[PDB]
Symmetry: D2
Subunit: 123 residues, 4 copies
């Protein structure tokens, strides 16, 4: 039921468009983040994901990576596609944002965490 | 300088292998984990990732998603590839391991978080 | 403006109650969780916390530790107390829920991470 | 066996001194962090914790909060006290660092995560 394929929106108002999945559960798409942590003109950026195939079909877990075209960072999302009842799909995801640092010494503070809620876009 | 391409081993005995790396930053690979949260014999699994090429640094950040073959769960990693003083490449990484719940009421207890340091296996 | 002192409820039906608040920032309280990762009847548990008073902001950050009475685990929370537009105080919070492993080889799989938004219960 | 009480050190070289625990498993102590995320003269700061009492004695989980006297943030640690074999104690902890933001709007990026290893101090 729960199909990643399509267009979704967030609670911060971010939007994401996701291609078609495969036998291997692969997919690609694009991301437009509403917010940034960098002082630097936001752009549409790419994602590469995967969606689990094993028997838990109905509501699968998944995860993608986003390659900021406008910053030196990377973000990764992972979560589950749910169907409340209505037949309303919801992505419940949690993500990790890695920033660039110049010496391993700094590594310690390069990782931020948090959530995101996605539901789909009309029309 | 620091590249994803190759065989790597991490502090827990897990090994993975990367390869591709478009001019995009995309790469696929396989990952063989030493460990698990599940009670099913481990099987090589595939991974999909990306490398940041913005302001082409000698230590880019990255991130990948491991689509577990033996489980219904998913793991995502992000980090940086640094060039340590020894002259050695080190992957400092962090992750979320998302597993499946049967109901969206149990979401809150589905995501684990941890660290991993990768090193080159090849001699 | 925003103070920890009181009864609060969060998006999962859990309630807690704070009280103290030295000139230090220390406070104790009790917490009654609606939810659990364990299979043992829940019992009110105590908490110990602190409030930042550096550059006495109207929205200080804080953090507390809930010493579960019904479990062998521990939870820690941190966040900020904000004054929302409505004029309402909101506790935006994030947590780690650490549980016990019998062997240090299983460490890597012991810590969960999540979010919680607290609101005032009192009328 | 594993007693929080005493003086410990970190992998980043941070030191911490921990008072005596109670029946309620409480404790207090002081922290000297080797590193900071703020441009602001490091100081010895206080912690308030708790250490679980329920039957899992030998190696207990625990958690403390640190009230930076020199910044607007808070950090929280939670983890387990281990005894490899030697009779060497090790704290394996993971922590959450909350920074101050000026509008709930920003909340999204105020949380950093990571680890820390503690072993004790001679003499
Ligand atoms: C997301 O899509 C909606 C649909 O109309 C649009 O109004 C909004 O501006 C988009 N926002 C971003 C940040 O892409
Ligand atoms: C890593 O590679 C070695 C070498 O063959 C293998 O024995 C080990 O099982 C691999 N690690 C795991 C646990 O998959
Ligand atoms: C929160 O308070 C209410 C009111 O008595 C109570 O019924 C509820 O159980 C408390 N929540 C939990 C699950 O502890
Ligand atoms: C920690 O304690 C050791 C013990 O001699 C000392 O040399 C070191 O400077 C201390 N470091 C900090 C950051 O407190």
């Amino acid at each position: 039921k729960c199909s990643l394929t399509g267009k979704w929106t967030n609670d911060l108002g971010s939007n994401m468009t996701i291609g078609a999945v495969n036998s291997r559960g692969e997919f690609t798409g694009t991301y437009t983040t509403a917010v940034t942590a960098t002082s630097n003109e936001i752009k549409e950026s790419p994602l590469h994901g995967t969606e689990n195939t094993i028997n838990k079909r109905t509501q699968p877990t998944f995860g993608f990576t986003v390659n900021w075209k406008f910053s030196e960072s990377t973000t990764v999302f992972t979560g589950q596609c749910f169907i409340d009842r209505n037949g309303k799909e919801v992505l419940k995801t949690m993500w990790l944002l890695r920033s660039s640092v110049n010496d391993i010494g700094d590594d310690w503070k390069a990782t931020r965490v948090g959530i995101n809620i996605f539901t789909r876009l009309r029309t």
